[PDB]
Design a protein around this ligand. Structure first.
Ligand SMILES: Cc1cc2nc3c(=O)[nH]c(=O)nc-3n(C[C@H](O)[C@H](O)[C@H](O)COP(=O)(O)OP(=O)(O)OC[C@H]3O[C@@H](n4cnc5c(N)ncnc54)[C@H](O)[C@@H]3O)c2cc1C
Ligand code: FES
Lengths: 92, 296
């Protein structure tokens, strides 16, 4: 139900406990962490992160192609954690 | 993250306070003259202003007033047609309505208000429609899914909807390649619904579609037990139970409440065979969108 997501931002490194059905950005928001976001709808680059380890369910987002998904790109507004995850944020 | 459809689904474009006024295009009894109770299939026009999706309901608000002078409360009816509709132009919605007539403890014959209004519609008549309503019976995202459809009486409706889209229609973004397995339980043969259409579907996708009828008053097994939906199911007992262990199996159940219990009891003894408590497994299947119930 709940996973540890470590968020590596350009200001260091935070730890969040994200429920398996709350979007990462949303938890981030709840715990006071300011992540960039724009559409909030999984069809632009604005909240782009990168999964360094672990796995996300990105629930049929629209922006990232298979290639990119394979490279570990995440849309942090449209991603659920499926495990303990380390994400690099702020990544346009 | 839903495992059911969400993109392109809308709800409540219309509410009881200001319904959409459509037109009855046709209204046809689909049960035989000797059935216990009439079921009617009927199609309304929607000018495309109600873009529903397979699984959803619409409400009907029947003409006139109740015994206290208030307008009648919405009654919901599962949509019997696919999103593109019986005419295939996206401007119609179809229902599958059972006419409710019953004798009460006092000896009086009572007519169910909305069911008799619906079943009485002539072509040309105005119908007050609301919706779409509901997210619960939406189809799985997965086009290669195992969809197990458990229906009694008019609970065939959303499944008539699913199966039209799966097997009678070409869509660029959806090519069904899983197994569709329909169980439909009625009390008599003359109560059967859409048999011919399902016949056609079995013919053109023998590998992708199965249909099993359970006619409680005309069929037994050799143990002498009447063929309710659960007793037909019992015959594929282990096959179904295997299928349930899978990521890509979604069970949908629609119709009369009280169909529910007979099915649970089949599952209960399947579960105990494995050390498993059925209800734990069930609520857990619900959390994965895999056991979807709309009974009434
Ligand atoms: C989500 C959903 C989907 C539905 N889909 C369908 C569908 O596809 N097709 C369909 O036909 N119906 C469907 N229904 C049922 C439908 O909404 C109506 O409840 C039904 O048609 C009866 O409505 P009515 O106005 O004719 O009866 P009413 O005038 O509302 O009278 C019903 C009342 O009479 C009593 N009563 C009801 N049934 C009986 C009975 N069998 N014997 C004795 N007393 C009784 C009860 O007190 C009940 O509250 C659905 C309901 C729901 C909630
Ligand atoms: S903000 Fe545009 S996709 Fe997350």
């Amino acid at each position: 139900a709940t996973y540890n997501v470590k968020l590596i931002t350009p200001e260091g490194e935070v730890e969040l406990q994200v429920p398996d059905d709350v979007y990462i950005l949303d938890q981030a928001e709840e715990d006071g962490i300011d992540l960039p976001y724009s559409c909030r709808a999984g069809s632009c680059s604005s909240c782009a992160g990168k999964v360094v380890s672990g796995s996300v369910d990105q629930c049929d987002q629209s922006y990232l192609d298979d290639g990119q998904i394979a490279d570990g790109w995440v849309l942090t507004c449209h991603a659920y954690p499926t495990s303990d995850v380390v994400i690099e944020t702020h990544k346009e | 993250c839903s495992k059911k459809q969400e993109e392109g689904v809308v709800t409540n474009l219309y509410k009881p306070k200001e319904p959409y006024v459509g037109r009855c295009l046709l209204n046809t009894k689909i049960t035989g003259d000797d059935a216990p109770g009439e079921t009617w299939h009927m199609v309304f026009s929607t000018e495309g202003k109600i873009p529903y999706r397979e699984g959803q309901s619409i409400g009907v608000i029947a003409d006139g007033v109740d015994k206290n002078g208030k307008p009648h409360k919405v009654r919901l009816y599962s949509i019997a047609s696919s999103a593109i509709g019986d005419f295939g132009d996206s401007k119609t919605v179809s229902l599958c309505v059972k006419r409710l007539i019953y004798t009460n403890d006092a000896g009086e014959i009572v007519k169910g208000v909305c069911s008799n209004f619906l079943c009485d519609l002539q072509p040309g008549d105005n119908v007050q429609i609301t919706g779409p309503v509901g997210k619960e019976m939406l189809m799985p995202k997965d086009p290669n899914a195992t969809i197990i459809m458990l229906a009694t009486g008019t609970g065939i409706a959303p499944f008539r909807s699913f199966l039209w889209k799966m097997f009678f229609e070409k869509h660029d973004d959806y090519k069904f390649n899983g197994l569709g397995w329909l169980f439909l339980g009625v009390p008599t043969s003359s109560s059967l619904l859409y048999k011919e259409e399902f016949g056609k579907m079995k013919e053109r996708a023998p590998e992708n579609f199965r249909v099993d009828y359970a006619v409680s008053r005309e069929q037994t097994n050799a143990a002498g037990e009447r063929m309710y939906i659960q007793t037909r199911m019992a015959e594929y007992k282990e096959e179904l139970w295997e299928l349930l262990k899978k990521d890509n199996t979604y069970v949908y159940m629609c119709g009369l409440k009280g169909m529910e219990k007979g099915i649970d009891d089949i599952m209960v003894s399947l579960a105990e065979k494995d050390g498993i408590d059925w209800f734990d497994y069930k609520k857990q299947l619900k959390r994965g969108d895999q056991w979807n119930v709309e009974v009434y």
